[PDB]
Design a protein around this ligand. Structure first.
Ligand SMILES: *[C@@H]1O[C@H](CO)[C@@H](O[C@@H]2O[C@H](CO)[C@@H](O)[C@H](O)[C@H]2NC(C)=O)[C@H](O)[C@H]1NC(C)=O
Lengths: 107, 220, 120, 58, 55
């Protein structure tokens, strides 16, 4: 199995500050990533697919990049609407596996 | 059922009710399998495609260029026609998107896909040939356009033919269909300044040597 | 589109609970479907998946041998038989659309909002 | 008479008439050969069979 | 120009396209320097372009 490692597990910043998180694979998974945003009380929303393709309806603040075993995610200049737990997911092989989740708080 | 292979693989609206088989030993069409291409044109190398699909060890469909996120600069909703109606509505092939000018422009299009998952991928696309320059201005805006498609084993530049043709299914123009197999590990690209119908869905597969096609009303 | 989970609730260990998911807005029979587990401790886990035609399934090792996944395309419905339940299976369960038919190629684009299964 | 897995039918378009006709030529030659040889085999063996039986009782 | 085959038999139509050796012939025979030819039917469509070259 391929297990994603996500870091930091908790992040905070003030509105307008630049926010980034990182996630690593235990195996080379090319670019087979799906980044998710889980707002409290909701099923997680897919925001970025195939590591860097921004999903429809997701604002330009969001961006992803990386390959192989080291991937990143940015939400650019942080807005209040972005409070969520962000998750790693990859689909290189079976089973599909998730990361631990990074809680992003704003203040 | 009542569909032929072109109908089934392109996504004729009337073939939507068919299930997807993961594998099959042979293909059965009835003598009345009339639902094929609904927007008239030349389906290129149709016989070779029919042979390749005759016996399949594994087959799956996947969305290749997502309808809502792949073309933010092009209109993917106005690409419908009375030639392929669905329940009385104008519609189009289920596995294809006919992109038209957004607002008053058609920005140069450039897209690619990498087949890094291991099966051969079948990609189909088409090209629109308007009957008049008045359609070229309504659908693509750019008066002088081209389409280019390629892979490590394929390269072709296409040019539209604007001409008034006899009406077929009330259309004075035509739309041709093209296809290729992208080997695992390869990349397929598309480029256009207009007149390109882009794949929405593509198939991943493995061929089981080959069988045959039976045309019959004998039940399964 | 919509995916609506049904079934759930509080049960004692042992026995079973049956979940289902109703699909709407898409040709259900054209897509592979799966269940995802959201535990209070482990953020997101996975349970099982079935191919679009129902021909093949894949299970987490943690539920393999117990759970059964099945579907009936004529009813646009996905089912999960949560047999031999334990305390460790308490989680919010979600159904989702993979946007492919064969497991290997795909994207889990759309999830329902889930249901809660509690074992105690 | 041990055969393998085959698929007989072939499909050609309207500008491939010469190929379809070649395919027919192939099917026809094989058909005439098998039909004729089969008739001779049956007629020959039936006579030999009946002689064999006549031999054993003789 | 057009023709409608409403009498019942299949109709065989032949035509040809001229490819001049020089632009001087194009001006003598067709006048238009930049030309094209198009032919079609419900099962046929082709746009042709002349090739001017000395052969
Ligand atoms: C699916 O096949 C049917 C049957 O061939 C098509 O219906 C015919 O459409 C033509 C053109 O409008 C009519 O002249 C015929 O009378 C219709 N036939 C019948 C039995 O009603 C139908 O258009 C095809 N649909 C698609 C999307 O290809």
């Amino acid at each position: 199995d391929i297990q994603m490692t996500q870091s930091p597990s908790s992040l905070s910043a003030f509105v307008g500050d630049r926010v980034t998180i990182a996630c690593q694979a235990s195996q080379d998974i090319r670019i087979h990533l799906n980044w998710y945003q889980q707002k409290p009380g909701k099923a997680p929303k897919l925001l970025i697919y195939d590591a860097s393709n921004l999903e429809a309806g997701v604002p330009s603040r969001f961006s992803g990049s990386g390959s192989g075993t080291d991937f990143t995610f940015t939400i650019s200049s942080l807005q209040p609407e972005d409070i969520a737990t962000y998750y790693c997911q990859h689909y290189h092989n079976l089973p599909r596996t998730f990361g631990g989740g990074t809680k992003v708080e704003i203040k | 059922g009542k569909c032929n292979i072109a109908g089934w693989i392109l996504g004729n609206p009337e073939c939507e009710s068919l299930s997807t088989a993961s594998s099959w030993s042979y293909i059965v069409e009835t003598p009345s399998s009339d639902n094929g291409t609904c927007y008239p044109g030349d389906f290129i190398d149709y016989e070779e495609l029919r042979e390749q699909l005759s016996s399949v060890s594994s087959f799956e469909r996947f969305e290749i260029f997502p309808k809502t996120s792949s073309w933010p600069n092009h209109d993917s909703n106005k690409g419908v026609t009375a030639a392929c109606p669905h329940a009385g509505a104008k519609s189009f092939y289920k596995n294809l998107i006919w992109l038209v000018k957004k607002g008053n422009s058609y920005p140069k299009l450039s897209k690619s896909y990498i087949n890094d998952k291991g099966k051969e991928v079948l990609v189909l696309w088409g090209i629109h040939h308007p009957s008049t320059s008045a359609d070229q201005q309504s659908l693509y805006q750019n008066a002088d356009t081209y389409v280019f498609v390629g892979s490590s084993r394929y390269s072709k530049k296409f040019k539209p033919e604007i001409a008034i043709r006899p009406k077929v299914r009330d259309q004075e123009g035509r739309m041709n269909y093209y296809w290729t197999l992208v080997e695992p590990g390869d990349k397929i690209t598309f480029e256009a300044t207009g007149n390109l119908v882009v794949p929405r869905y593509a198939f991943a597969m493995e061929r089981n040597a080959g069988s045959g096609i039976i045309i019959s009303d004998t039940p399964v | 589109v919509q995916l609506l989970e049904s079934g759930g609730g509080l049960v004692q260990p042992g026995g079973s609970l049956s979940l289902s998911c109703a699909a709407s807005g898409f040709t259900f029979s054209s897509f592979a479907m799966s269940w995802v587990r959201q535990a209070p401790v482990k953020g997101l886990e996975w349970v099982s998946m079935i191919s679009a035609g129902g021909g093949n399934t894949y299970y987490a090792d943690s539920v393999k041998g117990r759970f059964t996944i099945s579907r009936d395309n004529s009813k646009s419905t996905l089912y999960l038989q949560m047999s031999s339940l334990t305390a460790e299976d308490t989680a919010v369960y979600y159904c989702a659309k993979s946007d492919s038919s064969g497991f290997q190629y795909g994207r889990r684009e759309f999830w329902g909002q889930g249901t809660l299964v509690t074992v105690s | 008479m041990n055969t393998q897995f085959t698929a007989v039918g072939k499909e050609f378009n309207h500008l491939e008439k010469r190929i379809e006709n070649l395919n027919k030529k192939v099917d026809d030659g094989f058909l005439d050969i098998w039909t004729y040889n089969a008739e001779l085999l049956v007629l020959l063996e039936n006579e030999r069979t009946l002689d064999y039986h006549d031999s054993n009782v003789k």
